Write an enzyme that holds these catalytic residues in place. Structure first.
Site, mmCIF file in Angstrom:
data_model
loop_
_atom_site.group_PDB
_atom_site.id
_atom_site.type_symbol
_atom_site.label_atom_id
_atom_site.label_comp_id
_atom_site.label_asym_id
_atom_site.label_seq_id
_atom_site.Cartn_x
_atom_site.Cartn_y
_atom_site.Cartn_z
ATOM 1 N N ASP A 187 0.794 -1.225 0.000
ATOM 2 C CA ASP A 187 0.000 0.000 0.000
ATOM 3 C C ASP A 187 0.830 1.280 0.000
ATOM 4 O O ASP A 187 1.306 1.726 1.049
ATOM 5 C CB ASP A 187 -0.907 -0.051 1.221
ATOM 6 C CG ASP A 187 -1.911 1.072 1.284
ATOM 7 O OD1 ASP A 187 -1.714 2.147 0.675
ATOM 8 O OD2 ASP A 187 -2.928 0.856 1.990
ATOM 9 N N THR A 188 0.936 1.923 -1.160
ATOM 10 C CA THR A 188 1.691 3.158 -1.336
ATOM 11 C C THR A 188 1.033 4.343 -0.642
ATOM 12 O O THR A 188 1.664 5.399 -0.492
ATOM 13 C CB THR A 188 1.851 3.501 -2.828
ATOM 14 O OG1 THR A 188 0.587 3.526 -3.505
ATOM 15 C CG2 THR A 188 2.639 2.406 -3.531
ATOM 16 N N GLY A 189 -0.206 4.186 -0.217
ATOM 17 C CA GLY A 189 -0.926 5.233 0.494
ATOM 18 C C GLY A 189 -0.639 5.249 1.983
ATOM 19 O O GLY A 189 -0.812 6.246 2.682
#
Ligand SMILES: NC(=O)c1ccc(S(=O)(=O)N(Cc2ccccc2)[C@H]2CNC[C@@H]2N(Cc2ccccc2)S(=O)(=O)c2ccc(C(N)=O)cc2)cc1
Ligand SMILES: [Cl-]
Ligand SMILES: [Cl-]
Lengths: 99, 99
Positions: free
Chosen positions: A25-27
């Site tokens: 998850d890059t968020g």
């Protein structure tokens, strides 16, 4: 590997001698996992998103293996509905966004 | 391009003729933007974040550019902590995770 986003980018990880499924998850600034034991010191933190905030325990310098890569980083532990691997560890395995 | 994850992967988007900053979020299934006006009719949608599920507004076949790449797809509107570009549009522009 090159991982498609047609589906959720789920990987298996080893941590604490445990195997767990997690979302790349890059968020997420940091890695967040469901309740589990981890060694060493920790400190309390609140993290939040859609729906509000939860309290977590922040452990640092934790060893994690991901796709045969061994990384060291921070793990947030608490009542999350989804285990995610955050940027804090994605960098260590050299993960990038590409288009 | 190739985007590393030492910092948040914030990019410029254009929607409704306006420029906005948004986070490339591979943890988000969908695309959720701050309260704004969009054309047409909307439909109800429940999305689940770390603190729970909330209702947002769903607009379909909306034009949106992401780092200059043109897309057309579903955009959700609601009280998101930040504008996020989720897998529905990341796939559209050909974005993958690589390590
Ligand atoms: N369905 C959809 O499209 C959808 C779902 C859910 C959301 S979210 O608003 O919740 N949201 C975006 C977000 C939230 C806060 C800051 C920047 C961006 C999540 C998606 N990826 C990162 C977020 N998280 C992981 C997650 C949660 C739920 C489902 C899948 C993945 S997390 O557990 O909130 C978290 C928060 C903060 C931290 C931290 N501080 O390190 C770590 C983890 C948006 C969209
Ligand atoms: Cl409604
Ligand atoms: Cl779409």
């Amino acid at each position: 590997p090159q991982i498609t986003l047609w589906q959720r980018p789920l990987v298996t990880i080893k941590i604490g001698g445990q195997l767990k499924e997690a979302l790349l998850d890059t968020g997420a600034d940091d890695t967040v996992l469901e309740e589990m034991s981890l060694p060493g010191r920790w400190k309390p933190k609140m993290i939040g998103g859609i729906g509000g905030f939860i309290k977590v325990r922040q452990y640092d310098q934790i060893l994690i293996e991901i796709c045969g890569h061994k990384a060291i980083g921070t793990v947030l532990v608490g009542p999350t509905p989804v285990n995610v691997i955050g940027r804090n560890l994605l960098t260590q395995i050299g993960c990038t966004l590409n288009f």
